[PDB]
Design an enzyme around this catalytic site. Structure first.
Site, PDB file in Angstrom:
ATOM      1  N   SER A  51       0.835  -1.223   0.000  1.00  0.00           N
ATOM      2  CA  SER A  51       0.000   0.000   0.000  1.00  0.00           C
ATOM      3  C   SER A  51       0.867   1.270   0.000  1.00  0.00           C
ATOM      4  CB  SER A  51      -0.986  -0.056   1.161  1.00  0.00           C
ATOM      5  OG  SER A  51      -2.069  -0.977   0.825  1.00  0.00           O
TER       6      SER A  51
HETATM    7  C1  LIG Z   1      -1.957  -2.268   1.176  1.00  0.00           C
HETATM    8  O1  LIG Z   1      -0.992  -2.968   0.977  1.00  0.00           O
HETATM    9  C2  LIG Z   1      -3.196  -2.773   1.890  1.00  0.00           C
HETATM   10  N1  LIG Z   1      -3.003  -4.175   2.257  1.00  0.00           N
HETATM   11  C3  LIG Z   1      -3.913  -5.091   1.955  1.00  0.00           C
HETATM   12  O2  LIG Z   1      -5.059  -4.764   1.630  1.00  0.00           O
HETATM   13  C4  LIG Z   1      -3.506  -6.539   2.138  1.00  0.00           C
HETATM   14  C5  LIG Z   1      -3.713  -6.942   3.586  1.00  0.00           C
HETATM   15  C6  LIG Z   1      -2.663  -7.448   4.335  1.00  0.00           C
HETATM   16  C7  LIG Z   1      -2.841  -7.819   5.669  1.00  0.00           C
HETATM   17  C8  LIG Z   1      -4.073  -7.686   6.277  1.00  0.00           C
HETATM   18  C9  LIG Z   1      -5.127  -7.173   5.552  1.00  0.00           C
HETATM   19  C10 LIG Z   1      -4.944  -6.798   4.223  1.00  0.00           C
HETATM   20  C11 LIG Z   1      -3.431  -1.924   3.125  1.00  0.00           C
HETATM   21  N2  LIG Z   1      -2.116  -1.740   3.761  1.00  0.00           N
HETATM   22  C12 LIG Z   1      -1.992  -2.187   5.175  1.00  0.00           C
HETATM   23  C13 LIG Z   1      -1.409  -0.987   5.927  1.00  0.00           C
HETATM   24  O3  LIG Z   1      -1.854   0.159   5.558  1.00  0.00           O
HETATM   25  O4  LIG Z   1      -0.547  -1.278   6.813  1.00  0.00           O
HETATM   26  C14 LIG Z   1      -3.401  -2.642   5.749  1.00  0.00           C
HETATM   27  C15 LIG Z   1      -3.296  -4.012   6.421  1.00  0.00           C
HETATM   28  C16 LIG Z   1      -4.094  -1.647   6.675  1.00  0.00           C
HETATM   29  S1  LIG Z   1      -4.487  -2.890   4.262  1.00  0.00           S
END
Ligand SMILES: *C(=O)[C@@H](NC(=O)Cc1ccccc1)[C@@H]1N[C@@H](C(=O)O)C(C)(C)S1
Length: 503
Positions: free
Chosen positions: A228
């Site tokens: 992300s």
């Molecule tokens: C960006 O990479 C997003 N990640 C995902 O949607 C995959 C994911 C991984 C683990 C648990 C749930 C979803 C967002 N990025 C992270 C972050 O901002 O640290 C999140 C887990 C909040 S979702």
């Protein structure tokens, strides 16, 4: 005499040195005089008198001093690499058979230190000729290689003081999370000079321990599904295109993409929230939404304009281009939050630089020059270069306000990255890791590549710190929850003190 490798401040990272090897003539064949012997007569007593200078193993020494039909013997590694005093000490004792051959060794003063950038030179025993096998040593070998001609020096942008902060922090993260892969890089926000870079697991260029377990330099040759952190580039494209208004509301929750249900991380969403809060929460639905508003064809182009899917053209060997995943709408929509597409960490730093250089991407660089130390001729000199201007000053100022909120918003899910007394901004990332051997994604409790692309002080930052940890095998729950905050905070806090930033 192979060239030196220096840091930003003329401190030495690699140099040739004169050391000595121990040779004992055991076989009585030097018997032209028993009164003036040239071999080792009393084994017990010769063995004991050099125990005072070498590793002190009088039995192991006396053991080795006993072989079969060999004139000379060596004492493996503990009897190579001995000081010039260790020679004069053993020479004063006048032992018969014992001599010390000179040896030119490659010496890394800081040992395990920027090891995958600096690299290692290996010695041909027959000639003592050194060949770079990885990193700067390998890349610049012909310049570093030397009647007796002295080789050319290579000056890096690495600052040994900051490189220390990075080495300690990654050492702690291995003790706490024992991850499969881990890296941190400090870059000058305003120049794109790599001020510090390390990775784990790594090797010791001095001892040679763990060399060739991983050839790949993480910064330049290893690819990741960024996660992300990659949303900042989509948000920039959307701000420029008009799609993103911080105060306009959007329908959070989920989207149905080629029959699959891709959802926000809490699964439910938050219903209708402002796009500003969407980003602060790291909503995947926001990014898939903005991609629909802007267009699939226009977004592939926007990623290309931020430098992705093609090499930064830096000084490192075998630099990876990575790839923009864009074959079907499932790849495109997952690319919006940094899956499918593969990046190099250096691509990410190139991209991220645009937010702080009024839209200009800086080509990141670590080699500062290659000069002869006699002639003072610079065969090569690096400098700040623009890699692209994919966004306007305005777009950039607005991407910055979002990165400020990700950390400092009252509804932030990323306050673990705050640093007492310095204002920080950035974007977090948690991402699924592709299984080495096809097999879609790595399975396990929290099988993630956690990462953070931070910068301080906020708006007008001195440095950008980008750390990433992949598949923590211990405290894997704390990994998911805290990401790389335990590396980011110290690296950033010590780097700001060392550059005398106020507060
Ligand atoms: C960006 O990479 C997003 N990640 C995902 O949607 C995959 C994911 C991984 C683990 C648990 C749930 C979803 C967002 N990025 C992270 C972050 O901002 O640290 C999140 C887990 C909040 S979702």
């Amino acid at each position: 005499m192979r060239g030196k490798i220096y840091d930003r401040n003329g401190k030495v990272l690699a140099e040739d040195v004169e050391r000595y090897k121990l040779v004992a003539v055991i076989d009585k064949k030097a018997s032209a005089n028993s009164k003036k012997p040239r071999h080792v007569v009393d084994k017990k007593e010769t063995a004991k008198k050099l125990s005072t200078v070498i590793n002190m193993k009088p039995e192991e020494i006396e053991k080795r001093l006993s072989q079969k039909k060999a004139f000379q013997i060596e004492f493996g590694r503990k009897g190579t690499n001995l000081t010039y005093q260790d020679k004069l000490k053993i020479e004063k004792m006048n032992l018969p058979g014992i001599s010390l051959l000179p040896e030119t060794e490659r010496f890394y003063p800081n040992g395990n230190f920027a090891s995958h950038l600096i690299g290692r030179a290996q010695k041909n025993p027959d000639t003592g000729e050194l060949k770079g096998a990885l990193g700067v040593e390998k890349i610049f070998d012909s310049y570093l290689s030397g009647q007796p001609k002295r080789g050319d020096d290579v000056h890096l942008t690495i600052d040994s003081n900051i490189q220390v902060f990075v080495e300690e922090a990654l050492d702690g993260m291995v003790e706490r999370y024992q991850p499969k892969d881990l890296f941190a890089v400090v870059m000058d926000a305003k120049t794109g000079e790599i001020l510090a870079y390390s990775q784990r697991p790594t090797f010791n260029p001095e001892t040679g321990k763990d060399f060739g377990k991983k050839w790949a330099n993480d910064l330049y040759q290893n690819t990741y599904e960024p996660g992300s952190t990659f949303k900042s580039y989509g948000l920039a494209a959307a701000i420029q295109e008009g799609a993103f208004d911080p105060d306009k509301k959007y329908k959070s929750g989920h989207r149905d993409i080629m029959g699959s249900r891709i959802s926000d991380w809490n699964r439910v969403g938050w219903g209708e929230i402002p796009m500003s809060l969407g980003f602060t929460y790291s909503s995947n639905t926001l990014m898939m939404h903005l991609q629909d508003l802007v267009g699939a064809d226009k977004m592939k182009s926007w990623y290309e304009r931020f430098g992705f899917g093609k090499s930064t053209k830096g000084m490192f060997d075998g630099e990876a281009p990575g790839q923009i995943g864009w074959s079907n709408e499932l790849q495109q929509k997952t690319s919006s939050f940094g899956q499918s597409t593969t990046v190099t960490p250096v691509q990410m730093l190139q991209a991220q630089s645009a937010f702080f250089n009024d839209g200009n991407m800086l080509k990141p660089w670590f080699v500062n020059s290659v000069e002869n130390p006699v002639s003072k001729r610079q065969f090569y000199k690096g400098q700040k270069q623009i890699a692209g201007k994919p966004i306007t000053k305005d777009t950039a100022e607005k991407v910055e306000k979002q990165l400020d909120l990700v950390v400092n918003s009252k509804k932030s899910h990323a306050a673990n990255y705050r640093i007492d007394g310095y204002e920080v901004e950035g974007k977090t990332g948690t991402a699924q890791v592709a299984a080495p051997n096809g097999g879609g994604y790595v399975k396990g409790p929290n099988p993630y590549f956690v990462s953070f692309m931070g910068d301080a002080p906020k708006k007008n930052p001195k440095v950008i710190v980008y750390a990433g940890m992949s598949l923590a095998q211990k405290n894997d729950q704390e990994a998911y929850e805290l990401g790389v905050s335990k590396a980011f905070k110290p690296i950033m806090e010590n780097t700001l003190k060392y550059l005398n930033v106020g507060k």
